Amino acid sequence: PLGSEKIEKDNAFAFDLLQTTRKHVTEANVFISPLSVSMALNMTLNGAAGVTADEMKTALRETGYTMEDINEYSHSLREALLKVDPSTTIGMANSIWYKQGELVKEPFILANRTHYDAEVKAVDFSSPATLPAINGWCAQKTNDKITKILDYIPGNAFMYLINAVYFKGIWVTQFKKSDTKRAPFRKADGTTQEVNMMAQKSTFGYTTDECCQYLEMDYGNKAFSMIVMLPNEGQTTRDVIEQLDNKHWSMIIKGIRPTQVSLRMPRFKTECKYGLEKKILPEMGMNVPFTETADFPGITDAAIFISRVIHKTFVQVDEEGTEAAAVTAVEMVKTSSPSTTPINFHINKPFVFAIREKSTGVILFIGEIGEVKE
Template sequence: SVSMALNMTLNGAAGATADEMRTALREAGYTTADINAYSRELREALLRADPKTTIGIANSIWYHQGATIKAPFLEANRTYYDAEVEAIDFTSPTAVSTINGWCARKTNNRIKKILGEIPGNAFMYLINAVYFKGTWTTRFEKKHTFSTDFHRADGSTQKVQMMNLKDTFRCASSDVCDYLEMDYGNHTFSMVIMLPKDGKTTRDVIAAMDGKKWAETMESLILTMCYVYLPRFKAECEYKMHKQILPEMGMKLPFNPELADLSGIADISAFGRLFISSVIHKTFVQVDEEGTEAAAVTSVGVEVGSNESPFFIVDRPFLFAIREKGTGVILFVGEIGEVKN
């Protein structure tokens, strides 16, 4: 969700600003045209991947009424991202509810609010929304779900509803954690659970992981018969990506009101220098016996080996990722430190 919204913005970036954005998004060496073409292919591949799984990917551009936006910028986003483009009066009392209403519709009402208010100098919002609802290929039976303890990182415990089943899953193990992959629908999409080993934490797992190790681990997954114990859980998060995450990834110029070059969006002489004022990412994930429902909205504001144990018991903090196996794309990733039902 974040990368797609920023790739849309990239169509208006130039020079060092564009270079920083590509570097942060791990797209250095590719032209904007290359990135646009890949983004369209990826979006179309995800949408047709599994008829048994519901996935929606929607993009929109909202700009202040009366502004003249450069045609190539709008055309690229319509063509490659299927973006809906709307000019609205940002000073109108209904502007916020209009944009939030779009987000709600595109996420099946799971994310109802991406904007709280529109600042006076707001020029444009580029928004990407992703909605996913998958049914487990092998479902848990509700009658087997029971109440038990989940051990938080601080040593305290909480009662959770623990689902369980016995089946064949793809598993792997490393020095720091055990992996288990559970499929949805026709096996195209899956959730990978990363459970830290005794004495290890989710922070240890994250520190030991990079793109290469992740790919190697996914290749090493082996079919294993095991008992799986997984709590029902729900996660709702909001990240202000512009405050720390993206700058730490090397993306600083786009947020600088004096140095950012987003001249591909609109004429600087007419509006003054444009810059990205905020990148807000919100997610919703819910896992139960039937499967998983997940949604994400990002707004860019321009101002190894098999698991030896037959039991995989998720009763302590863990990580998860929802991925599409054909492309390898991770749609959602999260850390669960305590369980919200």
């Protein structure tokens, strides 16, 4: 039975994927949608049987769940996230591109469209038309947010699972564009760059660790929020990433209290591409689905396995927000701000961040910014 434990399980996968991805990636910035990846692999899982299916269900933390439940949960969760906040720009583009020849089984195709809005397409990987076709599919499905997803495909390819995810939201409380100033940011490589440092003094959700300062910044109609994990002087983002698990995440969320904060945040954009077949997904537990020995009878009677799992992400943070911060009485009174002095939350060094849905607690996106680019 698929109940609320599925949110905990998918979040448990989220942290594991973030940790595994960082272990195998050299890039300053990391940006992944583990939920979208889970859902994309759930597409392939429909065709999987035996050990092939077991290894997938193990890595995805779905052991015990039936395909009916997984499909019904995946379709309801994605359709809700994509419609819950109209002020928010969010997409989850999925597709399976297979070796032209033996046609894919109708139930597989049907399952894929119904629960994942996924196109299962037969291509001749040798044709010079294929790479433009895939990149074209990406641009239309992401309304040109993500326009290139593949640079090269060998002709010997079998089946490519392609997932393109993007997010852009507006804050509940906006940043004045007039308040944004040029300020330094300390890059992961030990260099210090100059960035467009946004600023606002407002009420935000706030808690602390032995390592970190955490801030919750609500988006749009409070359906989504961003959690900024600011390592303490001496601590690094690697220490943050290594420490995250549900027990630790629970401890953060439960500690979040409305706080008056002086915030400084850079304007940033990050676009990341991952080939999760190479080392990230095998390390997590699924090795067989990427080999000649994989059993996917639900896809075709002909031999087939996952050639590549392409995960491409996009996020953008700017000043834009729903309303202006109203004048508070403390501002007017011309006397003390009592109780607490506004906490200084200055993001001028690398940070870990997550985009979550507040009513269910699902982590849609998780990542690290070590270098500010816009």
